[PDB]
Structure formats: C-alpha cells, structure tokens
Design a protein around this ligand. Structure first.
Ligand SMILES: [Cl-]
Lengths: 324, 326, 324, 332
C-alpha cells in the first residue's frame, strides 16, 4: 500500500542527539545515531521502498522536557523547530512537522506553538510526557491548572497534541529498581504515558475544551484493554466519580483521543483497539528510527482488517485529521 | 450455566475487616461489611441463584501483606487460615480455601503453605502483592532471591499462587498525587500487579521452577494487550535481553500464568486474552464482594465465545487446575 | 440508543398479505398478519420504545417477484407503491419507502423506480430475489444482459437496491426435499441470495456501473466468511478468472455492497463482517415483523463494538447513504 | 512450527486420476497430475520443508462416489484402499490413511470401513458428498434411514468421517448455469457440503449415535458464520423445530463436528470459527495438491491466535482425535 502517512517519525539535532544514547546497546548506537540525524536521504529512500508518502517528523526524547531551565528550554525548542522547518521545506511533499514545545512555561509553549503553526506551517505538537523545571519541586504534568490557557491555545489553533513517553524519574520508579529491563518501551513508558493521559481526562480539561485532539502512540499504551474497568469497576456502588471531570473517562477517550500503531505491530492488539475505539481513530505510524520502517509497513500491509479500514488507518484518517 | 467455579471470592475476619473500609463510600460500607463477614448464608443463596457451584475463598486485602511484624503476620495468617478451614468444613461441597501467607518471612510462609495444603486441604495461596516487613527498608517483592526456597515449596506442593493487587506505597505513588481516583481498581492495582508479575518472569524463577502456576485476576492486569511489545519492541536490535531469565517473557506468561475474569467483565478484553493466551488459561471469577455476583455471572453467561470455551472458562479449567474432579 | 435508522422493515397490503402465510406456524399467523398490516400505530409505538427514529419500509415477499404476468406485476407494484407513499406521508419524519418493482419487465421496472424516486420520494428499491415470468422458461436473475439498461437507471438515480431473499423454485431445491426445515431463513434464503449477489459481481455489472449500491440483509448471507476463499482458492494456479468481470469478486464486494444486521443478531458474525468489509458498510436493520424489534435493538445496543461504530451502524451510515 | 498433522491431503491412482482433470487449466494439469500421483518423494520433501510430520492421506474426488454400479464402486474402493495401505507402509511414521468407501451400499461401505480400520490400520474415512447409485432415481445423502446401520458401525469403530465436497448434479445446479466459475471450491462445493452436513444434524442421527465425529474442511463451509441464524431466526415464535432431531442444530455442530483449515487460509475466518466452535475443534489441513503446502503452512505459522491454540490446531487436536500418540498406532 502506497500513499501511507506516518506520524511518529523521529529525528535528532546534534544538540539533542545524546538523549537517545541510553536506549539501545552500545554496538547499535552508531546505526541509531546515523538514522536520527538523517532526514533527506536514506529516510526518504525507505519511505519510497515501503509505501510512505508523508512522514510527520518530530524531535527525539526527552529532549526539551528534560531541559530544566525554562529559558534554555525555549531557546532549544526554537532552534529545533527552525531546523525542522528548513528540513521540511527541502522536500515539502514528503514531510510535515510537529512542534517541540517548552512546556516548562505554559505561556512560552503557547507562543511557540502559535509561531510553529502560523509561521512554520507545522501540523501539531509532540511532547515527551512530564516536564522538568528548576522552579518546580515536582515534575510538571499537563492536567495542572497553569496549563489551561495553553490548552485553550491548542484548541483555538485546532491542531493535535501527541503525548509521547518518557521514563518516570528515579524516585518515581523504585518498583523498577534492580529491574532496568522494564524501563523504556518494554513497559515503563506505557505506564507513564497512560497515567498522564488519564490525568488529562479526569481533570475535566475536555469538558472545558471539548474540541481538543490528543494522540497516543503504541496503540494507546494499554488503555483500550482496561478502559471498561477504568469506569465500571465496582459497578454495584452507585456514586459520583471522585475526579473533577463531569462524564465517564471513556467518553473523553472516545471523543478526544487518537491512537497510532507505533512500536505495537500486533494484530490482536489492533483488533482490540478497533472494537473499543474504532478504526476511524487509529493511525498508521512506525516510530522510526527506534523501530524499522520495513517491519512496521510489512506488518500493517497484511494485518487482518477490512481493506476499507486499512485505507483509513494507512492515510485516510490522517489526511482528515491534519487537513492534508 | 450452573456448575461454575469462582476463585477470587473474598471474606474478612473481624481482625482484617477494617482493611476494606474506605474502598467504598461510607454509605455503602454497611453493605460491604455484611458481605465480607457472611460466608454461610446469603453468599450461598447468591451462588445458587447465579449458577456457581464452588467458590474458592480468600482473605481480603492487603491483610497479612500489611502486617509489618513478621511474627504477628504469621499469627494472623494462622488464625485466618484456621477460621477459613472451619468455614469451608460447614459446606464442603460449595467451598475450598486459598492460604493467607506471612510472606514477610520466606520460611514461615513455606511452613504455613504446607500446613494449609497438607492439614487444611487448601488448594493454593492468595497474596496481595508486595509485603511490608519492619526489618526491610524496602517493600518485599517475590522475585527476590530469598523467595526462591519458598517457590521451591510451592512447586513441590503443586498448588497455584494467586497474585492479587494492593496499592503502591505513597512514596511510590507520586504520579497519582492529587488524583486519588486512579488508585485501587481504577488503574493503580493493575500497574502494581502487572509489574510484580513481570518481575517474577524476568527474574528467571520459571527457569528454575518451570512447573509453577501463577494466577492473575482482572484479565491479567493489561498484560495480554502489551505482551507482544514487552519482548518485541525495537526488534531490529539483535541482542540478549538484559534480565536473568533465559527465554522471552511471553514464554513464561504462556507456560506459567492463568488469568481470571474477576472485575473485568468486558467481551473485547476477553477476546483479546483468548487470542493471546488461549481459553485454556482463562478462569471465571467474580471478585465478590467488591463486584456483584449477578453482574459477573450475567456477563459471562452471554459473552461472545464458543460454548466449549464457556464450559472451560466457567468450570473445566479450574477443575483440572485444582484437581476438584480428583 | 435513540435515533436509529432501520431499513429492512416490512408491511403487506391485503393484496400481498397471504404471501407471508406459512412462514410461521398456524397459531402465530394472527399475530404476524396484524404486524404486517399495521404501519401507523403499534409499529411506531415500538419504534419509540426501542430507539428507532426512522423505518425505511418495504413490501413483503415474494410479492411482485412471484407475479408471473408482467402486466399484472406492474399493476400490483404501482398500487403497493402508491399505498406506501400515502402511508409514509402520514408520518413523514418516521418513515421512508423502498420501491417494489416489476423486475419481470426491465423497462417497466426502470420507469416505476423513476416514478417512485422522482414523484413519490422513495429512497431505493427492494426486490425479493429472482422473478418469475410466463414468457421466460427460466427464472430471471438480474445479472442477465436485459437488466443492464435498468441498472444504468438505478445508477443515474443514485439510490441503493436491496436484494432480499426468496426461496429457490422446487425444481432448483431438490437438495432440500424431505428437509423443508432448511427452506426460508434457516438456510435456503441465504444460499439463494448469496449466489444471486455473486452472479451480479462476476457478470461485470460493476465494471460498467461502478457507482451502484447493493444492500444485503442477514449480515451478507454468509458472504464475508467465505469471501477470501471465493477469489483465492487454489492460488498456486496463475490464471484469469473465468467470469466476465475484470477484477476480483472481493473488489466489488468492498466497493458496491452494504450489509444489514437483519435477522442475524450475532456478535461473532458482526465482528467477522467488521474485519472483512468494515463498519462503514454495515447498517442496523431488524426484519420486523418477522423478527422482533425488541430483540434486534437489545442485541445491537450491547454488541461488542466501539461506540463510534455503534453510532455509524445505528444511524450515521444510513444517513449518509440515503442523504437524510 | 514443526510437527504439524495435516488430514485433507489427496492422491489419485491411475484408475481415479482423470476425476481431477479439468479442475485446473490445461497448462497446469501436468503439475497437478504429478502431485496427485506422487506420495513417497517430493510430497515428503515438501512436508520436511514446511513443518508437517504426518499427512493423513485420502483418495481424490468424486472417485468412489461417482461409480454408480455399487459392485464396481466396492471394487474400486478395495483397490484404492489396498494401494493406500501399501503406500503408507513404505513410510509409516509420515503417513496414515483414510478409507475410500462404496456408500452406494450401506452394507458394503460398513464392511469396507471395518476392513480398513481393523486390517489396514486406517484412522477414519473420507467421502466426497452424496453418492450416485444406478438403483436410485435420486442422489444418495447420508441422513437417509438406510445409512443408520452404517453409522452404528462408524461409532462402534470410533473413527471420524470426513465429509468432503463434490459439485451438485447439473439438474440441481441451474442457479449456476452460465456461471460455471461458481462451481467447485469457489462456492458450490461449500453450499453442497454445508447442506449435506445440516441434513445429518437435522435428521436426529446424532441423537441415536451421539459419539460420532464428522470432519468438514474449508473452515466448515460457511457454517460458523450463519449457525446462530440457523436455530435462532424468527425467535419470537415459540415452537418445536420441524426436523426429527430433538435438540438445536448448534448442539450437534458443537458436539459432533470438527473443522479443518483446508483451502481457507483466512485469519478473520479462523477467529470467527474459534469464537463459535472453539480452537479445540479446529485442525490444520492444506488440501494438497489442490492447494500449496507452502501457502497453507506459511499462513498458519503467523495467524493471529495464541501459541497454545497454534499447537492444538497444528497437531495437538489431531494427535488426540486419531489416537496417534497411542500404542496401537506407535507400536503395532
Ligand atoms: Cl418464497
């Protein structure tokens, strides 16, 4: 299938490159590093070879979310975005950009998102989970009141926010002590991102801003499988849920979320996602260069869904979402 | 469908009762309290009305896992087991017991499991996640080396170990700060239990003791949906996984684990579990009294699976697993 | 779920009433007969109680298709259609009509479809499989060349054609001799209708008129389950299929067909249809009065699909299809 | 996955070879002919290359079912069965046999099945739909009363009966006239076989012999998708079904039938069958030489099911069904 749109497709700048070093064995780092820095050449050949018309590009991880000085975070985000705009402009029919944002300061993040969308033609934002900030004794999650004016801005711009993983901070990760193999994509990323996403939903953010669109990778970080249980556990109790939001969590999941297939090339899981959220809210993605383009495309080509849905997931849904 | 076997079915003693307080709103505590304390009477009428032949009973939560003096944990486990055995004996065709165990101390736990299996006729153990023990600065997880001789006894006895949830300790729960709605069955129970189970799998425990049987409630706490990703993430990398176990995580999930339907009455979730672990390793359970028997039974009666698999999940699998036809 | 649209919903006129007698046991005939005749009263109360906003009504079976004199068939069709228009006009927000057509004569059927659509505001046609005609020694199936100008007319009007069952003729039903329990909805209706549809697909009709929309009840009469096998059996043989159509049978199935849930209230069956043709092509229907509205609605309310797709199958798909 | 058991795997003798002609284009006949006649050599190499330990072999189609003189049918069945026994004995760890049977004559069919099971060590029978017999004005279907003593014998022997397709007779095939492309595996085989199987269930045969085991290829010829509808259509009517059987059709489908994956290598269809009849009653098979071994094995290797069910469908179910891990098959 030609014409696919892929939207969790990463690069690094020299400035952020080393953030990705921890995530593969030392012998595989030169390969991963070269993939991260390459945008124009091998990446596009592989797109050609595997039926991808367009990659929506985003910076690597944790990148800006780990830059604890908010002034420095803004400066880095702005440099990464200008670079990305220049890269996109070289092959404008094959690429779009997601913004890197300095979420350390809601106001700076809002301004940078406006610049990115209206000046640079970017089609959304991608943010690696909570932010570290020297002014805050705690990690910053985006359900917090200070972020409401930022979300108002997102909704006004009508572009999606892709909530990407990062690892929990060490003091929030003791369950994984002595078990580092569970950190990262194996498991810890999924738990961190699912809970951050649930925090947004429980906060009532989508009551106030009901047109917001949040994207999750990895087929939604386990959420569809346990979604029924999230609202319906202990159903014999008749009570008002103890979160600020007005409706059930699944209503927000159904109305405000999109899932991508990145790094989760499993037909059973896709079928479960289809039967919980619908093929209209599922988008093809690879997670290149952390996952191979060939693996992602070959799996997707042959997965056990209708051809009508393969088209929607392949490109139709993304076409509509990003007004492409 | 009559003849069902259910095996995540809880009671409290007056001693452990307060552990369940504040899992429900105040207005509902009189009802939960009465359910937890009733074994002989209304519980059996509900079983009769909803086609459950046998409930395998277990103490509530965290119960023994929160008794930080190991000597007292053992004393409590022993009293609760003796009580359970007495209650089982009043209606022996309708009940079996799971052991409560003082996991604070591996030798005490192994000895108590032996007594429960050999002297009391118990058919497995149920433990509410990690243990607190005054002697340990850190919570105790059962992948730790000190537990290996205990697991040797589990395998020798050839009875399953049900790994039930508890909440993370507050200092390991900062992600939920300001969001207490996420603690308990909503989410936190699932994460804590999935990770504890994965820690057992990655530790190599099942290489050393391959015949062990571990049971998880709640359709495996999310595990089936993300199981492919656990082993296969970043597949382009050819490397040996950085855990001590010798095989893939999914090999031990497939070979050593069973899932029950407790508190997760969702047909899509069941189908996904069937397509990942197979109907032979899925067991009906309810999580009474925290979930209604009528809700669990009515959902299961009509869920979209073959009748052959309805019989296996309803009773066939448990009959084989627990040797009840034997 | 309020606002459902249901589109295999039957009535009889006194003229066609007895065609339905003997589909149910004698003790049940008085009930069925009263249901068939009632359009305005109990039927609407039941729609209210079971969340159906609109029923697209069609005549019973075999009706016009068993009237062998083509002139008589056209007279009966006109009366039934005029009656239906008068009935729809009494409660115009709750009903629409499908045309009955004298398929015995392709020109008369085209003209009657035109009159029904243009003058009566009907939104499609419903036909009970093959037609009997005195002038023809064989039953008339609609893939035959004489039907092509009719199909040109259907396409130009841009309204769907609902291919409903009837039983095979006795000389074409010997396999059921001594086994009358297999006739009708049990099995024979499904075989008869699947093959009629497949004849349409293989004939090349949809090469010539690619915008045609055909609707099948009963979740597609077994088609999705065996659809892969229809094209891909004996795949090691590299050859051109021996039918006149230019593409695979499944291409026409995917592009030209819709399925309804009528009389097949089975979640496993619906999931298989979703994974083969996609939820965009599946439509809620009951087969009232042959099946109960309460059974149909209760099953569909709780079936194991996404809320997005429940809305699409419930009403969204029909709204789009019929331009309501 | 090595170790698979496949049980819809065909051969021809020179006697029955021409029955398979005109199933494929002329250009492909030399290949199909060579596959049908080869049992010992390339067939085993392809089994080795695609992870099949055992093929349970059966004659091609319609073969015995089209021999209308019952005396001649019995003669052909005997010769075909002796040939198969001799062939199996050459490589007894890789092959088992299904009986070809002269179903024209209930008595002859029962005696030949006895001979095949007791003397030749065959593990079931495979019959290609209805029989033509000169004495009968109508095609012979196995729900008919005269077959009940034959089925008593099947149950007593406790071996399965694989009901394979054949086309309807032309006079029963007018719906396909001018549409020959629908004949055969495309569609007509499936309709024919589904109905024949339904006639057995409706007849009450399984009330009388409840231990019978019937096998269907092609994932059960459409039956699972439409099984709910078979019993439950028009449910508001409270009535006794108008067939002689005492129970619901689905009760017999669930209790007396097995389905194989032959010629239906479709994951959506497998999942549907799993959720209707259960993986315990599904068996890997290929339909070699009419389907490729490699296509069947490659699809099954990667289909979206549990590893536990992949072992059951791949070999476990068949190993148990045909008692292949048992003394009479291993040592005698
Ligand atoms: Cl009829």
């Amino acid at each position: 299938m030609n014409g696919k749109i892929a939207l969790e497709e990463h690069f690094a700048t020299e400035e952020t490159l080393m953030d990705s070093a921890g995530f593969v064995p030392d012998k595989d780092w030169p390969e991963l590093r070269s993939r991260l820095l390459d945008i124009q050449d091998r990446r596009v050949r592989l797109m050609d070879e595997h039926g991808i018309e367009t990659m929506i590009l985003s910076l690597n991880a944790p990148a800006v979310q780990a830059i604890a000085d908010s002034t420095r975070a803004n400066e880095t985000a702005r440099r990464a975005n200008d670079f990305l705009a220049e890269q996109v402009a070289k092959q404008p029919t094959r690429f779009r950009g997601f913004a890197a944002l300095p979420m350390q300061d809601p106001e700076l993040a809002a301004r940078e998102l406006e610049r990115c969308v209206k000046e640079l033609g970017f089609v959304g934002a991608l943010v690696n989970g909570f932010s570290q900030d020297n002014r805050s004794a705690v990690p910053l999650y985006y359900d917090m009141a200070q972020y409401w004016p930022f979300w108002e801005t997102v909704q006004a711009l009508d572009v999606p926010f892709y909530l990407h993983p990062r690892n929990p901070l060490p003091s929030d990760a003791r369950i994984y002590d002595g078990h580092a193999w569970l950190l990262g994509p194996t498991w810890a990323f999924g738990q961190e991102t699912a809970v951050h996403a649930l925090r947004l939903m429980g906060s009532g953010l989508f009551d106030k801003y009901p047109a917001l669109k949040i994207i999750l990778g990895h087929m939604g970080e386990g959420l569809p499988y346990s979604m029924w249980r999230i609202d319906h556990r202990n159903a014999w109790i008749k009570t008002t849920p103890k979160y600020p939001a007005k409706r059930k969590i699944v209503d927000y999941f159904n109305e405000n979320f999109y899932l991508t297939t990145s790094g989760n090339f499993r037909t059973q899981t896709l079928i479960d996602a289809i039967l919980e959220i619908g093929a209209d809210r599922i988008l093809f993605s690879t997670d290149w260069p952390f996952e191979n383009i060939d693996h992602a495309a070959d799996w997707f080509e042959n997965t056990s869904i209708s051809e009508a849905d393969r088209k929607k997931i392949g490109w139709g849904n993304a076409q509509n979402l990003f007004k492409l």
